[PDB]
Design a protein around this ligand. Structure first.
Ligand SMILES: Nc1nc2c(ncn2[C@@H]2O[C@H](COP(=O)(O)OP(=O)(O)O)[C@@H](O)[C@H]2O)c(=O)[nH]1
Length: 318
């Protein structure tokens, strides 16, 4: 029987990106027909993300040199099926325009999907008539996984079964207790959300923390190893330079140091629990960059050993 792993997290923690990444690395990836289903949302995101920046450049007074010609940037209507011929061209001009670039740097804050820059840098290839999304596009594109995804992979000749629990907090609860005999629960959280508000909970950070505190006391998850992926370490490093951590936690003295800062956030989730960073009741932690296949491969590897060691010591095996 396969080793079972359950992914939990808040929204926009990147847990769905982790799951696609493991299917690519250890599953069979995604076949052309599965990939082609993502064409419309990717094509749509190209336009909507850029409308966002144009609108924000007005709200934030960064005048534009360039002026869009295409049908697509004269309307708020949903995005049609084949792009107008001029769409490609003015996406490239727009992204190179001084005012748009200035607006992009003030990304904190309005709400710009993480995939924006990737979409723009890839527009020549996305706007082609015969374009079929690649696995890398699927990694970077934003999708809403209304939540219950299963699959199997193998790692170093050992069967794994992955349960990806999505949905509202209210249905997430339903599924956690449905699955029996889970060997490992992986909690994913976005480091870059430390400054984002909400309104029960006030901020994204406190909402994630309370989710995690659930996992730690959930009686159906006793027996399961608890791992935390502090995700979006890349985004967090950079974000720290525009929104310093002590503007959110004035009781913090570590400054620009993304390592010390990630630890500070990590310690807010784990309190008095014993913890262990896999990079050299007990909670294992590791920062991650889910859009980096190489990073997720190296990191899940450490994880397999932690899961195996633990199971051996708990009288479970294979
Ligand atoms: N830059 C960066 N983006 C990420 C990372 N992890 C996830 N994302 C992005 O976050 C967006 C949505 O995250 P998603 O996997 O759908 O979250 P979930 O479904 O709520 O668990 C996608 O556009 C991803 O490309 C990361 O480590 N780095």
């Amino acid at each position: 029987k396969p080793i079972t792993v359950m992914l939990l997290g808040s929204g926009e923690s990147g847990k769905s990106t982790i799951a696609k990444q493991l299917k690519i690395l250890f599953g069979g990836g995604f076949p052309e027909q599965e990939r082609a289903t993502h064409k419309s949302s990717i094509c749509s995101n190209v336009v909507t993300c850029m409308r966002t920046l144009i609108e924000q450049s007005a709200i934030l007074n960064h005048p534009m040199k360039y002026q869009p010609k295409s049908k697509e940037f004269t309307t708020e209507d949903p995005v049609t099926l084949p792009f107008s011929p001029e769409l490609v061209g003015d996406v490239e001009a727009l992204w190179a325009d001084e005012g748009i670039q200035a607006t992009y740097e003030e990304s904190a804050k309005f709400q710009l999907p993480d995939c924006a820059k990737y979409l723009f840098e890839n527009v020549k290839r996305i706007a082609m008539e015969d374009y079929v999304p690649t696995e890398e596009d699927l990694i970077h594109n934003r999708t809403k996984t209304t939540g219950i995804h299963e699959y199997d992979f193998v790692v170093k000749d050992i069967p794994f079964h992955l349960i990806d629990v999505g949905g509202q907090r209210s249905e997430r609860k339903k599924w956690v207790s449905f699955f029996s005999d889970v060997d490992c629960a992986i909690f994913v959280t976005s480091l870059a959300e430390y400054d984002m508000k909400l309104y029960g909970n006030t901020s994204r950070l406190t909402e994630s923390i309370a989710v995690f505190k659930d996992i730690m006391t959930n009686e159906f998850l006793k027996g399961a190893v608890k791992l935390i992926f502090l995700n979006k370490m890349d985004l967090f490093e950079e974000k720290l330079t525009k929104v310093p951590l002590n503007t959110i936690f004035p009781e913090y003295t570590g400054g620009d140091n993304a390592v010390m800062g990630a630890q500070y956030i990590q310690q807010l989730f784990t309190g008095k629990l014993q913890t262990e960073e896999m990079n050299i009741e007990k909670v294992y932690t590791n920062p991650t960059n889910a859009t980096d296949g190489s990073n997720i491969k190296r990191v899940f590897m450490l994880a397999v050993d932690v899961i195996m060691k633990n199971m051996a010591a708990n009288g479970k095996m294979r």
